[PDB]
Amino acid sequence: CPVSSYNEWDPLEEVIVGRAENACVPPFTIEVKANTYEKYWPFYQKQGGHYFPKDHLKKAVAEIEEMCNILKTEGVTVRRPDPIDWSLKYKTPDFESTGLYSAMPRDILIVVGNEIIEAPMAWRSRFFEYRAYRSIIKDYFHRGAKWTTAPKPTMADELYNQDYPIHSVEDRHKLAAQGKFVTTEFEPCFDAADFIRAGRDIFAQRSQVTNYLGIEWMRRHLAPDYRVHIISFKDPNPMHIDATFNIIGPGIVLSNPDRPCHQIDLFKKAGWTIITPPTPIIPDDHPLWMSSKWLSMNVLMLDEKRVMVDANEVPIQKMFEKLGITTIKVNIRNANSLGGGFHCWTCDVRRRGTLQSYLD
Amino acid sequence: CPVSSYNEWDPLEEVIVGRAENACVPPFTIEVKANTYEKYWPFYQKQGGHYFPKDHLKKAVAEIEEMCNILKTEGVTVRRPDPIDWSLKYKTPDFESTGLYSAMPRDILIVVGNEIIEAPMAWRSRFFEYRAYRSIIKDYFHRGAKWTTAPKPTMADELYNQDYPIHSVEDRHKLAAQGKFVTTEFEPCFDAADFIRAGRDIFAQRSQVTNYLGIEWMRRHLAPDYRVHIISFKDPNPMHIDATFNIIGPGIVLSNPDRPCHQIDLFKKAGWTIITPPTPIIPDDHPLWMSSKWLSMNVLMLDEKRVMVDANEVPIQKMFEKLGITTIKVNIRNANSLGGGFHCWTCDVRRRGTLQSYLD
């Protein structure tokens, strides 16, 4: 089967890498507001529905092409989504919106074994994001892979707390700690990037885009072979888990020092090594429209001893090297702006290995 | 689990019954043309995008309410889809269209065991038909049922043979025999009503709305527990199998005399009883916008010895009675016009019984 990946570190053979082409700023609706830094709120308000800065997008395209060249050199087969104009305005019976991009394969696709699963998403501007990936998925389907699409939400107003009392990121953190998110439990919704894989155990977090109904859907769909565990963090990332708790090997995880895990003892009891990466050196002046400076730890493992890491973030490169992990340095500084690092910009389709348990 | 149905005849405990409210004539696109009788082509051309005749719809509503009263009297729990205005025009990045209705639960939902599966559909006017059923499905999901949505097609032009050389129903039959349908194999598509259940064995037909990719998707998704077999018929019904080969008990099937099954010997070898129902007596003057006069055999089994059958079709009532099967006569003459009989207007959610093999 062309599709076969049970975790985040076995020898990578095939990967899907996203595109920066035609990326559009999403309209400033409540769920966008709840997943971005106040600093950028006026940018969303003014540029909503327009392309991201074209001079910036062009630099990202260049950086990503080079990343693909390096992947091919490292023996990895690269697939890319179809080019699409994300500015088209679509309309369902529940809402109207323009699209976002197909830059982050990790946000929408997740491979569990021989199965590729398309996440439902939770943003209105990402309702039709799966269209960029269908040519690839149908190809794998024709070659034997299982293909699943989690239930697509209506994304009607009921799925959101229109009046989410967030005036700043500190408020979101307080609300988050209270168990209050911009998304309700009206219907299942989730981004695939809120799940991180370790063989028979998958970890997920309830976030601004991934509700308990969405996690239960995954849990119920994957059982009995896979166990889905819910974990939480202090000052959690609004959406996605791969720049907070990035699992990099059998029993080894990178834990973001600013977002400590409440269930860290479960990992310590299992004898896992928790590594806290050095702080990011990315300029505070550099625009990160989504995500944060912690993209530095959003690494991609080519195998247990080869990591693709940012060329600029020397301190984390040095951490991997003292651990005997070969660093493959690639610069994606402008690509980061879109909200992702190496783990976000890819979706590992095939890794050489078997299904195993590491939590014991 | 509130959801549990392995076949078409075990004691029915819960059912979803469709609605005739706000039903809209679909625009006359190629796939509608390929699934209707020439006689009605000009009606689709003129009335496309408008409500079906309101005086006709009102009579159907009345007939269906009475059917529900009878179901409750027979001990069956009835659920209905949400009322929705099907006239809203929606737009995806591939096409624009108005909707159809939520009259036929059998066309979109199929229950296999404890799992409710939403079919992708193949008509543009039915892209958002699932919206009427989400309140019910989420309720069953909260109560323990598994819920699956087959991959929703883009329904881009590539899925259709825009130039399908059909000038009359005789042409469609000839093309059908040639293995040429209005739908291509561009992406998976299917209506749940092209599948009929008999425990571990499910039968499907490749039709104008159900392609081989769609059937393979079901086959791959249900294996190893269920086996999906493909069968074909002479002068097949354009879409849906339940008025051609309606399985009514362990090893007993109603076979439409005008559409004989090519693989009939597989059933005879298994010792199944094939019954050919008497001809329909429905007036040729009565409008059947979709389907045909064979709705008479589109019966619904309440259990092995209780069948819900049309009050007007006396000859088929007499056939069941000589077989010792109690006939529960209900008149749905105006409801038939929309394209369905009892099996079409319902989706059995819970039947009292176990998973078994009848093909041996």
PDB file of N, CA and C in Angstrom, chain B residues 18-95:
ATOM      1  N   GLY B  18     -39.230  10.257   5.571  1.00  0.00           N
ATOM      2  CA  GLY B  18     -39.001  11.544   4.910  1.00  0.00           C
ATOM      3  C   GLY B  18     -40.098  12.597   4.929  1.00  0.00           C
ATOM      4  N   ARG B  19     -39.773  13.780   4.400  1.00  0.00           N
ATOM      5  CA  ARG B  19     -40.705  14.911   4.316  1.00  0.00           C
ATOM      6  C   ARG B  19     -40.905  15.344   2.870  1.00  0.00           C
ATOM      7  N   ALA B  20     -42.129  15.758   2.541  1.00  0.00           N
ATOM      8  CA  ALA B  20     -42.454  16.239   1.192  1.00  0.00           C
ATOM      9  C   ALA B  20     -42.401  17.765   1.155  1.00  0.00           C
ATOM     10  N   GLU B  21     -42.321  18.390   2.325  1.00  0.00           N
ATOM     11  CA  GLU B  21     -42.261  19.867   2.437  1.00  0.00           C
ATOM     12  C   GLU B  21     -41.114  20.605   1.714  1.00  0.00           C
ATOM     13  N   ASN B  22     -41.481  21.615   0.927  1.00  0.00           N
ATOM     14  CA  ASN B  22     -40.517  22.478   0.215  1.00  0.00           C
ATOM     15  C   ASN B  22     -39.693  21.809  -0.867  1.00  0.00           C
ATOM     16  N   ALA B  23     -40.174  20.659  -1.330  1.00  0.00           N
ATOM     17  CA  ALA B  23     -39.500  19.905  -2.375  1.00  0.00           C
ATOM     18  C   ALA B  23     -39.427  20.771  -3.606  1.00  0.00           C
ATOM     19  N   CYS B  24     -38.256  20.787  -4.234  1.00  0.00           N
ATOM     20  CA  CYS B  24     -38.004  21.577  -5.429  1.00  0.00           C
ATOM     21  C   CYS B  24     -37.662  20.752  -6.635  1.00  0.00           C
ATOM     22  N   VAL B  25     -38.167  21.170  -7.793  1.00  0.00           N
ATOM     23  CA  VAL B  25     -37.870  20.507  -9.052  1.00  0.00           C
ATOM     24  C   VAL B  25     -36.381  20.850  -9.313  1.00  0.00           C
ATOM     25  N   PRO B  26     -35.539  19.838  -9.586  1.00  0.00           N
ATOM     26  CA  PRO B  26     -34.126  20.173  -9.828  1.00  0.00           C
ATOM     27  C   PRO B  26     -33.899  20.741 -11.213  1.00  0.00           C
ATOM     28  N   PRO B  27     -32.877  21.600 -11.359  1.00  0.00           N
ATOM     29  CA  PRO B  27     -32.609  22.159 -12.683  1.00  0.00           C
ATOM     30  C   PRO B  27     -32.381  20.976 -13.636  1.00  0.00           C
ATOM     31  N   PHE B  28     -32.734  21.150 -14.899  1.00  0.00           N
ATOM     32  CA  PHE B  28     -32.571  20.080 -15.859  1.00  0.00           C
ATOM     33  C   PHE B  28     -31.127  19.943 -16.368  1.00  0.00           C
ATOM     34  N   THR B  29     -30.282  19.314 -15.567  1.00  0.00           N
ATOM     35  CA  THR B  29     -28.901  19.101 -15.953  1.00  0.00           C
ATOM     36  C   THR B  29     -28.833  17.675 -16.503  1.00  0.00           C
ATOM     37  N   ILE B  30     -27.703  17.306 -17.111  1.00  0.00           N
ATOM     38  CA  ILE B  30     -27.505  15.979 -17.711  1.00  0.00           C
ATOM     39  C   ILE B  30     -27.820  14.755 -16.834  1.00  0.00           C
ATOM     40  N   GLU B  31     -27.424  14.783 -15.560  1.00  0.00           N
ATOM     41  CA  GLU B  31     -27.683  13.648 -14.673  1.00  0.00           C
ATOM     42  C   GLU B  31     -29.169  13.498 -14.299  1.00  0.00           C
ATOM     43  N   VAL B  32     -29.929  14.588 -14.337  1.00  0.00           N
ATOM     44  CA  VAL B  32     -31.369  14.523 -14.062  1.00  0.00           C
ATOM     45  C   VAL B  32     -31.963  13.873 -15.320  1.00  0.00           C
ATOM     46  N   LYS B  33     -31.584  14.403 -16.482  1.00  0.00           N
ATOM     47  CA  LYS B  33     -32.056  13.895 -17.759  1.00  0.00           C
ATOM     48  C   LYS B  33     -31.841  12.393 -17.912  1.00  0.00           C
ATOM     49  N   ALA B  34     -30.713  11.899 -17.416  1.00  0.00           N
ATOM     50  CA  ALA B  34     -30.399  10.476 -17.516  1.00  0.00           C
ATOM     51  C   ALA B  34     -31.124   9.604 -16.499  1.00  0.00           C
ATOM     52  N   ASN B  35     -31.819  10.219 -15.551  1.00  0.00           N
ATOM     53  CA  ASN B  35     -32.514   9.454 -14.526  1.00  0.00           C
ATOM     54  C   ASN B  35     -34.021   9.658 -14.505  1.00  0.00           C
ATOM     55  N   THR B  36     -34.582  10.164 -15.604  1.00  0.00           N
ATOM     56  CA  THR B  36     -36.030  10.407 -15.724  1.00  0.00           C
ATOM     57  C   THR B  36     -36.600  10.002 -17.107  1.00  0.00           C
ATOM     58  N   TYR B  37     -37.918   9.779 -17.174  1.00  0.00           N
ATOM     59  CA  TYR B  37     -38.585   9.429 -18.433  1.00  0.00           C
ATOM     60  C   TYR B  37     -38.794  10.652 -19.307  1.00  0.00           C
ATOM     61  N   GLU B  38     -38.491  10.506 -20.597  1.00  0.00           N
ATOM     62  CA  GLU B  38     -38.611  11.576 -21.606  1.00  0.00           C
ATOM     63  C   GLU B  38     -39.888  12.371 -21.441  1.00  0.00           C
ATOM     64  N   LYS B  39     -40.957  11.662 -21.117  1.00  0.00           N
ATOM     65  CA  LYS B  39     -42.249  12.279 -20.924  1.00  0.00           C
ATOM     66  C   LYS B  39     -42.148  13.504 -20.012  1.00  0.00           C
ATOM     67  N   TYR B  40     -41.311  13.422 -18.980  1.00  0.00           N
ATOM     68  CA  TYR B  40     -41.164  14.510 -18.019  1.00  0.00           C
ATOM     69  C   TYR B  40     -40.077  15.528 -18.265  1.00  0.00           C
ATOM     70  N   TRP B  41     -39.259  15.293 -19.280  1.00  0.00           N
ATOM     71  CA  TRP B  41     -38.177  16.206 -19.603  1.00  0.00           C
ATOM     72  C   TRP B  41     -38.635  17.654 -19.772  1.00  0.00           C
ATOM     73  N   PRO B  42     -39.773  17.891 -20.445  1.00  0.00           N
ATOM     74  CA  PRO B  42     -40.159  19.300 -20.565  1.00  0.00           C
ATOM     75  C   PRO B  42     -40.636  19.926 -19.252  1.00  0.00           C
ATOM     76  N   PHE B  43     -41.115  19.100 -18.324  1.00  0.00           N
ATOM     77  CA  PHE B  43     -41.556  19.584 -17.011  1.00  0.00           C
ATOM     78  C   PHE B  43     -40.332  20.067 -16.227  1.00  0.00           C
ATOM     79  N   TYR B  44     -39.224  19.352 -16.371  1.00  0.00           N
ATOM     80  CA  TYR B  44     -37.997  19.711 -15.680  1.00  0.00           C
ATOM     81  C   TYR B  44     -37.407  20.978 -16.265  1.00  0.00           C
ATOM     82  N   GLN B  45     -37.519  21.098 -17.588  1.00  0.00           N
ATOM     83  CA  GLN B  45     -37.030  22.249 -18.359  1.00  0.00           C
ATOM     84  C   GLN B  45     -37.778  23.533 -18.020  1.00  0.00           C
ATOM     85  N   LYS B  46     -39.082  23.428 -17.826  1.00  0.00           N
ATOM     86  CA  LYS B  46     -39.850  24.597 -17.490  1.00  0.00           C
ATOM     87  C   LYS B  46     -39.882  24.903 -15.998  1.00  0.00           C
ATOM     88  N   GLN B  47     -40.106  23.882 -15.168  1.00  0.00           N
ATOM     89  CA  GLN B  47     -40.207  24.080 -13.722  1.00  0.00           C
ATOM     90  C   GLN B  47     -38.945  24.010 -12.894  1.00  0.00           C
ATOM     91  N   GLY B  48     -37.807  23.773 -13.529  1.00  0.00           N
ATOM     92  CA  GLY B  48     -36.555  23.687 -12.801  1.00  0.00           C
ATOM     93  C   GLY B  48     -36.272  24.832 -11.850  1.00  0.00           C
ATOM     94  N   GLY B  49     -35.973  24.514 -10.595  1.00  0.00           N
ATOM     95  CA  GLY B  49     -35.688  25.542  -9.618  1.00  0.00           C
ATOM     96  C   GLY B  49     -36.893  26.051  -8.853  1.00  0.00           C
ATOM     97  N   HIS B  50     -38.079  25.553  -9.211  1.00  0.00           N
ATOM     98  CA  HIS B  50     -39.349  25.933  -8.578  1.00  0.00           C
ATOM     99  C   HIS B  50     -39.852  24.764  -7.738  1.00  0.00           C
ATOM    100  N   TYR B  51     -40.775  25.032  -6.813  1.00  0.00           N
ATOM    101  CA  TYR B  51     -41.362  23.984  -5.967  1.00  0.00           C
ATOM    102  C   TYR B  51     -42.194  23.030  -6.795  1.00  0.00           C
ATOM    103  N   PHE B  52     -42.293  21.782  -6.355  1.00  0.00           N
ATOM    104  CA  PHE B  52     -43.138  20.838  -7.055  1.00  0.00           C
ATOM    105  C   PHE B  52     -44.541  21.400  -6.799  1.00  0.00           C
ATOM    106  N   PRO B  53     -45.510  21.074  -7.661  1.00  0.00           N
ATOM    107  CA  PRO B  53     -46.880  21.573  -7.499  1.00  0.00           C
ATOM    108  C   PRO B  53     -47.364  21.516  -6.051  1.00  0.00           C
ATOM    109  N   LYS B  54     -47.638  22.685  -5.494  1.00  0.00           N
ATOM    110  CA  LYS B  54     -48.057  22.779  -4.105  1.00  0.00           C
ATOM    111  C   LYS B  54     -49.333  22.056  -3.676  1.00  0.00           C
ATOM    112  N   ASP B  55     -50.246  21.835  -4.615  1.00  0.00           N
ATOM    113  CA  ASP B  55     -51.481  21.114  -4.321  1.00  0.00           C
ATOM    114  C   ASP B  55     -51.141  19.617  -4.259  1.00  0.00           C
ATOM    115  N   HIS B  56     -50.159  19.211  -5.050  1.00  0.00           N
ATOM    116  CA  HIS B  56     -49.730  17.830  -5.047  1.00  0.00           C
ATOM    117  C   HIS B  56     -48.933  17.550  -3.768  1.00  0.00           C
ATOM    118  N   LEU B  57     -48.035  18.467  -3.401  1.00  0.00           N
ATOM    119  CA  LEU B  57     -47.227  18.295  -2.201  1.00  0.00           C
ATOM    120  C   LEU B  57     -48.069  18.187  -0.956  1.00  0.00           C
ATOM    121  N   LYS B  58     -49.155  18.943  -0.899  1.00  0.00           N
ATOM    122  CA  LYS B  58     -50.034  18.928   0.264  1.00  0.00           C
ATOM    123  C   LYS B  58     -50.707  17.566   0.476  1.00  0.00           C
ATOM    124  N   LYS B  59     -51.085  16.905  -0.614  1.00  0.00           N
ATOM    125  CA  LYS B  59     -51.687  15.578  -0.538  1.00  0.00           C
ATOM    126  C   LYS B  59     -50.659  14.553  -0.054  1.00  0.00           C
ATOM    127  N   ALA B  60     -49.408  14.673  -0.508  1.00  0.00           N
ATOM    128  CA  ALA B  60     -48.318  13.777  -0.082  1.00  0.00           C
ATOM    129  C   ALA B  60     -48.058  13.930   1.406  1.00  0.00           C
ATOM    130  N   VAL B  61     -47.993  15.163   1.894  1.00  0.00           N
ATOM    131  CA  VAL B  61     -47.811  15.430   3.321  1.00  0.00           C
ATOM    132  C   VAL B  61     -48.885  14.664   4.128  1.00  0.00           C
ATOM    133  N   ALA B  62     -50.141  14.776   3.695  1.00  0.00           N
ATOM    134  CA  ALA B  62     -51.258  14.095   4.358  1.00  0.00           C
ATOM    135  C   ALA B  62     -51.049  12.581   4.389  1.00  0.00           C
ATOM    136  N   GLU B  63     -50.733  12.000   3.230  1.00  0.00           N
ATOM    137  CA  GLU B  63     -50.494  10.555   3.100  1.00  0.00           C
ATOM    138  C   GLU B  63     -49.355  10.066   3.953  1.00  0.00           C
ATOM    139  N   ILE B  64     -48.282  10.854   4.027  1.00  0.00           N
ATOM    140  CA  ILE B  64     -47.115  10.484   4.835  1.00  0.00           C
ATOM    141  C   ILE B  64     -47.404  10.602   6.341  1.00  0.00           C
ATOM    142  N   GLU B  65     -48.192  11.592   6.739  1.00  0.00           N
ATOM    143  CA  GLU B  65     -48.539  11.714   8.148  1.00  0.00           C
ATOM    144  C   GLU B  65     -49.315  10.471   8.600  1.00  0.00           C
ATOM    145  N   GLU B  66     -50.227  10.012   7.751  1.00  0.00           N
ATOM    146  CA  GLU B  66     -51.022   8.829   8.052  1.00  0.00           C
ATOM    147  C   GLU B  66     -50.112   7.586   8.130  1.00  0.00           C
ATOM    148  N   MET B  67     -49.133   7.506   7.234  1.00  0.00           N
ATOM    149  CA  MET B  67     -48.187   6.395   7.230  1.00  0.00           C
ATOM    150  C   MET B  67     -47.466   6.380   8.574  1.00  0.00           C
ATOM    151  N   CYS B  68     -47.070   7.555   9.064  1.00  0.00           N
ATOM    152  CA  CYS B  68     -46.386   7.638  10.356  1.00  0.00           C
ATOM    153  C   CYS B  68     -47.319   7.216  11.498  1.00  0.00           C
ATOM    154  N   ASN B  69     -48.594   7.585  11.408  1.00  0.00           N
ATOM    155  CA  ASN B  69     -49.550   7.188  12.437  1.00  0.00           C
ATOM    156  C   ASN B  69     -49.635   5.657  12.478  1.00  0.00           C
ATOM    157  N   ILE B  70     -49.688   5.040  11.307  1.00  0.00           N
ATOM    158  CA  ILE B  70     -49.756   3.589  11.219  1.00  0.00           C
ATOM    159  C   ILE B  70     -48.479   2.962  11.755  1.00  0.00           C
ATOM    160  N   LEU B  71     -47.316   3.546  11.458  1.00  0.00           N
ATOM    161  CA  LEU B  71     -46.065   2.992  11.980  1.00  0.00           C
ATOM    162  C   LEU B  71     -46.056   2.986  13.512  1.00  0.00           C
ATOM    163  N   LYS B  72     -46.494   4.089  14.105  1.00  0.00           N
ATOM    164  CA  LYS B  72     -46.543   4.192  15.559  1.00  0.00           C
ATOM    165  C   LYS B  72     -47.490   3.152  16.118  1.00  0.00           C
ATOM    166  N   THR B  73     -48.593   2.920  15.421  1.00  0.00           N
ATOM    167  CA  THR B  73     -49.569   1.916  15.837  1.00  0.00           C
ATOM    168  C   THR B  73     -48.957   0.510  15.731  1.00  0.00           C
ATOM    169  N   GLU B  74     -48.066   0.299  14.770  1.00  0.00           N
ATOM    170  CA  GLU B  74     -47.431  -1.002  14.617  1.00  0.00           C
ATOM    171  C   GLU B  74     -46.226  -1.175  15.545  1.00  0.00           C
ATOM    172  N   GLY B  75     -46.070  -0.252  16.489  1.00  0.00           N
ATOM    173  CA  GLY B  75     -44.970  -0.312  17.437  1.00  0.00           C
ATOM    174  C   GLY B  75     -43.630   0.261  17.000  1.00  0.00           C
ATOM    175  N   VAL B  76     -43.613   1.053  15.935  1.00  0.00           N
ATOM    176  CA  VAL B  76     -42.359   1.608  15.444  1.00  0.00           C
ATOM    177  C   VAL B  76     -42.143   3.074  15.859  1.00  0.00           C
ATOM    178  N   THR B  77     -40.944   3.393  16.353  1.00  0.00           N
ATOM    179  CA  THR B  77     -40.593   4.768  16.739  1.00  0.00           C
ATOM    180  C   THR B  77     -40.250   5.519  15.458  1.00  0.00           C
ATOM    181  N   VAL B  78     -40.909   6.643  15.213  1.00  0.00           N
ATOM    182  CA  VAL B  78     -40.664   7.410  13.999  1.00  0.00           C
ATOM    183  C   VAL B  78     -39.868   8.702  14.237  1.00  0.00           C
ATOM    184  N   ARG B  79     -38.866   8.966  13.392  1.00  0.00           N
ATOM    185  CA  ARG B  79     -38.071  10.189  13.467  1.00  0.00           C
ATOM    186  C   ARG B  79     -38.286  10.810  12.109  1.00  0.00           C
ATOM    187  N   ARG B  80     -38.280  12.144  12.031  1.00  0.00           N
ATOM    188  CA  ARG B  80     -38.461  12.862  10.761  1.00  0.00           C
ATOM    189  C   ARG B  80     -37.321  13.838  10.571  1.00  0.00           C
ATOM    190  N   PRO B  81     -36.955  14.123   9.310  1.00  0.00           N
ATOM    191  CA  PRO B  81     -35.870  15.083   9.080  1.00  0.00           C
ATOM    192  C   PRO B  81     -36.368  16.497   9.427  1.00  0.00           C
ATOM    193  N   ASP B  82     -35.440  17.448   9.523  1.00  0.00           N
ATOM    194  CA  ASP B  82     -35.764  18.834   9.839  1.00  0.00           C
ATOM    195  C   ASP B  82     -36.373  19.485   8.623  1.00  0.00           C
ATOM    196  N   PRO B  83     -37.337  20.398   8.821  1.00  0.00           N
ATOM    197  CA  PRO B  83     -37.987  21.107   7.714  1.00  0.00           C
ATOM    198  C   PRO B  83     -36.948  22.083   7.174  1.00  0.00           C
ATOM    199  N   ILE B  84     -36.811  22.122   5.855  1.00  0.00           N
ATOM    200  CA  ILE B  84     -35.822  22.970   5.204  1.00  0.00           C
ATOM    201  C   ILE B  84     -36.361  23.455   3.870  1.00  0.00           C
ATOM    202  N   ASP B  85     -36.026  24.686   3.508  1.00  0.00           N
ATOM    203  CA  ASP B  85     -36.443  25.220   2.229  1.00  0.00           C
ATOM    204  C   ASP B  85     -35.393  24.800   1.195  1.00  0.00           C
ATOM    205  N   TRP B  86     -35.760  23.857   0.345  1.00  0.00           N
ATOM    206  CA  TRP B  86     -34.859  23.331  -0.662  1.00  0.00           C
ATOM    207  C   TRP B  86     -34.614  24.215  -1.859  1.00  0.00           C
ATOM    208  N   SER B  87     -35.261  25.375  -1.869  1.00  0.00           N
ATOM    209  CA  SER B  87     -35.122  26.288  -2.994  1.00  0.00           C
ATOM    210  C   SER B  87     -33.876  27.181  -2.928  1.00  0.00           C
ATOM    211  N   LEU B  88     -33.196  27.216  -1.775  1.00  0.00           N
ATOM    212  CA  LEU B  88     -31.980  28.023  -1.626  1.00  0.00           C
ATOM    213  C   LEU B  88     -30.962  27.605  -2.668  1.00  0.00           C
ATOM    214  N   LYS B  89     -30.353  28.582  -3.312  1.00  0.00           N
ATOM    215  CA  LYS B  89     -29.361  28.317  -4.316  1.00  0.00           C
ATOM    216  C   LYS B  89     -28.029  28.355  -3.609  1.00  0.00           C
ATOM    217  N   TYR B  90     -27.236  27.302  -3.739  1.00  0.00           N
ATOM    218  CA  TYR B  90     -25.922  27.280  -3.102  1.00  0.00           C
ATOM    219  C   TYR B  90     -24.871  27.245  -4.182  1.00  0.00           C
ATOM    220  N   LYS B  91     -23.618  27.440  -3.790  1.00  0.00           N
ATOM    221  CA  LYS B  91     -22.538  27.481  -4.751  1.00  0.00           C
ATOM    222  C   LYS B  91     -21.247  26.932  -4.160  1.00  0.00           C
ATOM    223  N   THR B  92     -20.694  25.900  -4.782  1.00  0.00           N
ATOM    224  CA  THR B  92     -19.433  25.352  -4.314  1.00  0.00           C
ATOM    225  C   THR B  92     -18.413  25.868  -5.346  1.00  0.00           C
ATOM    226  N   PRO B  93     -17.125  25.531  -5.187  1.00  0.00           N
ATOM    227  CA  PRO B  93     -16.178  26.037  -6.184  1.00  0.00           C
ATOM    228  C   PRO B  93     -16.306  25.353  -7.560  1.00  0.00           C
ATOM    229  N   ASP B  94     -17.138  24.318  -7.629  1.00  0.00           N
ATOM    230  CA  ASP B  94     -17.304  23.553  -8.853  1.00  0.00           C
ATOM    231  C   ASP B  94     -18.609  23.771  -9.594  1.00  0.00           C
ATOM    232  N   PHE B  95     -19.640  24.207  -8.881  1.00  0.00           N
ATOM    233  CA  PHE B  95     -20.948  24.381  -9.488  1.00  0.00           C
ATOM    234  C   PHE B  95     -21.892  25.143  -8.577  1.00  0.00           C
TER     235      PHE B  95
END
